[PDB]
Design a protein around this motif. Structure first.
Motif, PDB file in Angstrom:
ATOM      1  N   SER A 187      14.297  68.366 -13.849  1.00  0.00           N
ATOM      2  CA  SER A 187      13.233  69.507 -13.517  1.00  0.00           C
ATOM      3  C   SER A 187      13.256  70.540 -14.305  1.00  0.00           C
ATOM      4  CB  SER A 187      12.806  69.513 -12.313  1.00  0.00           C
ATOM      5  OG  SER A 187      14.146  70.309 -11.895  1.00  0.00           O
ATOM      6  N   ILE A 197      19.897  67.826  -8.640  1.00  0.00           N
ATOM      7  CA  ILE A 197      19.037  68.578  -9.478  1.00  0.00           C
ATOM      8  C   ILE A 197      19.158  68.899 -10.435  1.00  0.00           C
ATOM      9  CG2 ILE A 197      16.653  70.198  -8.918  1.00  0.00           C
ATOM     10  CD1 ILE A 197      17.068  70.428  -5.588  1.00  0.00           C
ATOM     11  N   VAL A 212      23.011  71.267  -7.681  1.00  0.00           N
ATOM     12  CA  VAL A 212      22.203  71.870  -9.263  1.00  0.00           C
ATOM     13  C   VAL A 212      22.557  72.199  -9.706  1.00  0.00           C
ATOM     14  CG1 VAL A 212      21.554  73.300  -6.420  1.00  0.00           C
ATOM     15  CG2 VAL A 212      22.239  74.157  -8.423  1.00  0.00           C
ATOM     16  N   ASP A 246      21.975  74.795 -12.871  1.00  0.00           N
ATOM     17  CA  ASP A 246      21.354  75.597 -13.501  1.00  0.00           C
ATOM     18  C   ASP A 246      22.363  76.997 -13.764  1.00  0.00           C
ATOM     19  OD1 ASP A 246      18.026  76.551 -13.039  1.00  0.00           O
ATOM     20  OD2 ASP A 246      19.578  78.322 -12.819  1.00  0.00           O
ATOM     21  N   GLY A 300      12.494  73.325  -9.767  1.00  0.00           N
ATOM     22  CA  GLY A 300      13.756  72.967  -8.534  1.00  0.00           C
ATOM     23  C   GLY A 300      14.120  72.901  -7.141  1.00  0.00           C
ATOM     24  N   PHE A 316      16.960  74.614 -11.244  1.00  0.00           N
ATOM     25  CA  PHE A 316      16.916  75.525  -9.973  1.00  0.00           C
ATOM     26  C   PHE A 316      15.580  76.525 -10.489  1.00  0.00           C
ATOM     27  CE2 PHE A 316      18.326  76.395  -5.903  1.00  0.00           C
ATOM     28  CZ  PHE A 316      18.377  75.809  -5.337  1.00  0.00           C
TER      29      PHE A 316
END
Lengths: 334, 334, 334, 334
Positions: free
Chosen positions: C95, C6, C31, C33, C13, C9
Motif C-alpha cells: 500500500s 504491510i 510493516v 516504512d 497501511g 505505513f
C-alpha cells in the motif's frame, strides 16, 4: 437512585442525558421540551460531534423509549406547571437557558422538585459550585437553587486553585480558544454581539467571557485578580484555556507541572487531568474531565510569570459535571 | 528602479511578487523555481486566499509575461549558479525557506547580488529588521544578508515598542491564534513536530513560536522578557497576537489605547493600525499593515497587567514589508 | 493464522492494520516504512478522523509493540530485499502507492510472499477484485498479484451489479462528492492536477475519477457503459456516490429500493447496506460496509432514468475490504 | 432612476443592495426591516463572504446613509402599511420569504407599489421569470407579482434551454453541490428537515430541491423531464450544478461545448459564461453571471447521455439578476 428531571432538551439537556446514562446513582425519569418527540429522538440518537448514542432509542406516543425505559416528555412552557413532585423527581436540571434568575428557577420547587441545578451562570442562585473546587461549601439546609457555572469556568477553576494554593496568584489574564457554539451565526446575521453575528466557521472571532470573573464565586481570594476574553474558531467542539499568571513565589516549569500533576493524580483526580503528550483538539473530543493540562505548553518567564494551557471538551466535561453535582447533592440528603 | 530577483516562487514568493506590482520603485526581473512555468502562472493568476491577480499573466517559452514585462524563470537547484549579476539583479528575496543560514543565503552575493533579504528568521544574518522598529539600524556598508524576521515578529514588535517606551514592559507572554500554513498536514501524516502532523483543518493545534524571543533582536531591551506559543486553527489566512504584559507604571485602558492610537497615527503609521470596531478575522484578509490593534479588547488588572490584541494577515502584511525593506535598502545605496 | 506483512505505513497501511485488529484470523507480523517508529506509534495511536486506537501501542527499539504482539518494522526502500519468506509472511498488503505495476509488486514474491494485494488500482495485475462482486473469479493457481480497486469502485460496484442484474444498465454517469485526501494541498501549491493544487478545505474541487470505468474490470458487461468525475469538498472523511442511470426496463422508486434492499439483506450483506433514515456524512464515519444506499434519495424519471445515491466511509469501508480479501484468498489455498 | 424599495434586509436584501449600487438605472430609496439601524449598517459594511462595501455607510437616526444618500428604513411587520406610494417606490423586491404567495405579496401593490419581484420561488405568481430564458414573456399589463425563481433555477435554465433547443433533452437529472445557507444549523438543532438540523460545516448533507422541476415554469417543453437533489457541503458561497441528461440527437463533447460557447457569447452573454480553465469554487466568489459552464468537465457516453457542470455564485449572480429584472420590467413601462 436520585430521580432526575431535565428542563430543555437542547444540546446541554441531551448531553446531560447521555452522561447520566453512564451513572447508576442518577435516573432521568422525565424531560420537558416543546419539540416533537420524533425530532428529539432523532437528535438524541445522532450527533455530528458525539456520534450515535449507544442505546436503542424510540418514540411511544409522545414519550421517548431509551433501552426499554420510557421517558415522560412534558411540553409545558411554564415551569410552574411541570408537576415534578407527582412523578417523584427530586432534582431538576434547568437547561432551557430562559430560567437563570432564581425566581424563575424556583418555579420548579413550586412544582415539587427539591433541588434545581442551573446548567449555566445564574443571577441570585443560592450557590455556584465548581466540582473539585467548592462542593464542600454546599449546604443542604440553605442551598436549593444551585449554578454549575460555565464550561470555561469548570476548566479554569481546578487549576487556578492549585496554582493559587501552591504559589499564590497576584493577578492573571486568560484567553479561551473556543469552538463555535449554537449562539453564533452560520453566515452574517443580526446578533446582539456584532462579533458573533459573523459567519462562524469562516473566522477567528474575538468575544467575551465572564469565566475569569466567575472564578471568584468558587475561589473568593481570586476576587479581582483575573480577566480574559474568548476567541471562537472554526471547530465544533473542544476548546482551550490559556492562562498567564503573575505568581508570588519564584517557580520553574518543573515545579509548576509537578504541582499540577500531583493535584490531578490526587485531590483533583477525575476533574483535573495532566498530559505530557503533544495532542491536538480532536483528541480531547469525548473527554469527560473538566480540564487537562497540556504539560508541554507550561512556560515561565523571570521566575514569576507563568503560562498554563489546559484542554476541555466543553460539551462532554461540563455535562459529566452536572451529573456529578446531581449525585453529590443527593448524597447530602434530599 | 531597483532590480529584484526572487528565490522560490511559492506562496511568499508569489505574495512578494503581488506586493511588488504596487511599488513603482521596485522591479522584479527574475524568479527562481523548479516548477514548470505553466503551473507557476496558474498559481500567480489564481489564488484561494487572495483572489485573481489583477494583471495579464502569460507564458512566453519558459518565462512569465506579467503586464507585458518578461520575467526570467530560472530553475537552478543551487544558489551559486543563479548568476544574478549577469542579469543585473541587485536585491534577491530569498524565500525558499531552505537558505536561512548565512552559509546558504550568502551564496547569492557570490552569484552577483548586492544584497539578500531572507524572508524568514535567519541564522548568522548581518542584521534582522522589523520595518517601523529598527530600520534605523541598517548599515549599507556592513549589512548585506538581512533577515525580515517573521509575520508574527512583525506583528508584535511595533506595539511592544510603544508599550515599552511608554510604560516599560517588566515581562510579557504571548499567544498567536494563527491560520494554518503549508508546513502542516492535510490528514494525519508524518512531520517533525507531532503536533503539526495532524489534520490542520480539523483542530486547534498548540505549536511553538520563536516570534516572542525574536523581538529581542529588534528591541534589545526586551531580551529575556517575552515568551509565547502559537495555536494554529482552521482558517486559511489572518492571525491574531494576544499579549499579556506586566508594565512598570500603573495605567488605564484609555491610556494604553491612546498611546497605541497616537503611534498608529504618528510614527508607526502604515505599520501599526488602530481599530475601534468589532471586526473578525475575515475582515483583515488583504490588509497590508503589520499590526492592527483590536482596541475593543484592551484589558488591564491591578493597573499593572495589560492584554493587547493585534490582528495581522500573515501573508499580505509580511509581503508588503519585504518589498518595503527592499525599497528601503535600495534607498540607502547599492 | 494468516500472516500478513504491510508495505508502507501511511493512512491506508495504518487503517488496514486497525481493520485487521478485529479479525483473530489475520495477524500483521511486520510493516515496512521509512518513518521512525516513534512517529509511527504516535500516528497509530491518534487519528483525527478515526480517534484513539483502543490498544496499547509502544515502541521496542526499532519495533512497535501492539497489544502484547511485537510487530517488526522494516525500513527497506526496495521490496526485493524484504525477506517476507524468512519471517513467514504469506500475504503482503502493498500500500505504498509506488508498486502498482505487476512487475514492481512481484518483488514481494521474489522475497518470499505467496500473494500480493495492491490497495489501489493496478496495472497488469492478475485480477482486480471488488469483494461481493467477483471474488468467485479469483483463481488460486493463476492469480498472485491482486488489486482491490479503489474506495470509490468498491462503493459503486456492488449496487451497479444489482441495478444491472435486475433492470439492466444501458448507460450511466456518476459523480462522487468526495472528502479531501492526502493527495490535495492545504494551501495553493504545485500539483500535477491544477484543480488539486488549490486549498482543499476552502473550495468545491472538480477532479477526475477512474472509478466508473474500473467497474468493467469487475462487471465486464458494463464495459463502455459508465462514466463519471469527482468533486472534492471540505470534509476529511466519508464520501458519496451519485449515479444517474438509464435502465432498459420500466421501474419505480419502490421497485429499485426493494431490489437494493433485498441484495443488502441477502447476497451483499456486510458489503452493501440500505438506509431509509435521513442521515448526513458524519454519521457514516467508522462505517465498515462498502456501500450504503441512501434510500430516501432514490429518484425516477420516465420510468427509465434512476438516480441512486450511496454512501461510503472511504477510509474504513476500504480497509475492511482489504482485510476480508486477505482472508478470502488465504481461505482458497496458499 | 427607477425607484425600488426592499422588503427584508437579510442576506438577499443586502446582496440586492450591493448589486443595485452598480446599476445606474435603479435606485433603492427605502428598505424595510425590524433590525436596528446599527446592526444593519454593520452588516452592510462588512460581510464574511463579500468583503467590505466600497461605499461610505452611516446612521442618521433610524436611517442609513450610503454615499451621501439617506435610505429611509421602515419597520413594519405588515406590507400594507409600508406606504410605498408616498416615497415614490415603483418596484418592491420582496426578499423576506414570508410573502411568497401572490395574495400576500400583492399587499405591496396596496401600499402604492407598481410591481413586486419575489426573490424566491413563489406560489400563484403572475409570472416566474429566469433572466435570459423567458423575460420576453413578460407583460406590463398582465404581470404585477413576478418571481425571479431561485439561484439554482437561474443556473440550470440558461444552459438546459441551449442543450434542448439544440439537441432536444429527452430526460435529465441534476445534483446541485451547494454551499451551506442561513437555513441550516451550526450544531445539531431542531429543523423541519432532519438533514438540515445537522451541523452544517461538518458534513455533506443531502436534501431536496425544486430547481429541477421549477425549470418548466421557464421552459415549458421540459415539463416532467427534469428532477434533481442537493448536497449541502462545508463552504459559505459558490455552488455547482451537475446535469446528466439523455439527448435526442447523437452528440460529441466538442459539439456540446461549441453550442454552449456560442450561447455564451451572443444570446446569453452576461447570463451564461463559458470556461476552459481548471478552476475551483473560490475562483467564482463574486461572479455575477448566472451560469458558468466548466467546459473541461463536459462528458458524453453512447453519443446520447451527457454531463454538463455549471458554476454559480449563489448569492452574487442571483442578486444581479433581481437587479437586472428590476431594470427590464421598468424598461417596459410603469
Amino acid at each position: 437512585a436520585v430521580k432526575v428531571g431535565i428542563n430543555g432538551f437542547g444540546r446541554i439537556g441531551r448531553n446531560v442525558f447521555r452522561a447520566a446514562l453512564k451513572n447508576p446513582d442518577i435516573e432521568v425519569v422525565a424531560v420537558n421540551d416543546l419539540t416533537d418527540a420524533n425530532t428529539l429522538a432523532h437528535l438524541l440518537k445522532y450527533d455530528s460531534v458525539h456520534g450515535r448514542l449507544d442505546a436503542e432509542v424510540s418514540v411511544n406516543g409522545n414519550n421517548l423509549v431509551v433501552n426499554g425505559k420510557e421517558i415522560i416528555v412534558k411540553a409545558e412552557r411554564d415551569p410552574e406547571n411541570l408537576a415534578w413532585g407527582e412523578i417523584g423527581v427530586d432534582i431538576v436540571v434547568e437547561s432551557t437557558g430562559r430560567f437563570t434568575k432564581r425566581e424563575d428557577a424556583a418555579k420548579h420547587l413550586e412544582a415539587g422538585a427539591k433541588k434545581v441545578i442551573i446548567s449555566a451562570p445564574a443571577k441570585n442562585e443560592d450557590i455556584t459550585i465548581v466540582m473539585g473546587v467548592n462542593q464542600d461549601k454546599y449546604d443542604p439546609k440553605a442551598h436549593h437553587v444551585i449554578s454549575n457555572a460555565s464550561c470555561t469556568t469548570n476548566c479554569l477553576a481546578p487549576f487556578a486553585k492549585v496554582l493559587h494554593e501552591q504559589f499564590g496568584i497576584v493577578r492573571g489574564m486568560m484567553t479561551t480558544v473556543h469552538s463555535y457554539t449554537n449562539d453564533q451565526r452560520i453566515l452574517d446575521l443580526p446578533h446582539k454581539d456584532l462579533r458573533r453575528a459573523r459567519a462562524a466557521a469562516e473566522s477567528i472571532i474575538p468575544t467575551t467571557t465572564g469565566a475569569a470573573k466567575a472564578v471568584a464565586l468558587v475561589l473568593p481570594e481570586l476576587k479581582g485578580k483575573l480577566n480574559g476574553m474568548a476567541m471562537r474558531v472554526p471547530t465544533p467542539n473542544v476548546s482551550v484555556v490559556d492562562l498567564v499568571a503573575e505568581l508570588e513565589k519564584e517557580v520553574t516549569v518543573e515545579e509548576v507541572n509537578a504541582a499540577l500533576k500531583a493535584a490531578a493524580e490526587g485531590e483533583l483526580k477525575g476533574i483535573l487531568a495532566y498530559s505530557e503528550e503533544p495532542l491536538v483538539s480532536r483528541d480531547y473530543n469525548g473527554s469527560t474531565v473538566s480540564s487537562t493540562i497540556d504539560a508541554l505548553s507550561t512556560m515561565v518567564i523571570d521566575g514569576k510569570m507563568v503560562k498554563v494551557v489546559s484542554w476541555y471538551d466543553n460539551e462532554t466535561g461540563y455535562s459529566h459535571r452536572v451529573v456529578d453535582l446531581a449525585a453529590y447533592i443527593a448524597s447530602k440528603g434530599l
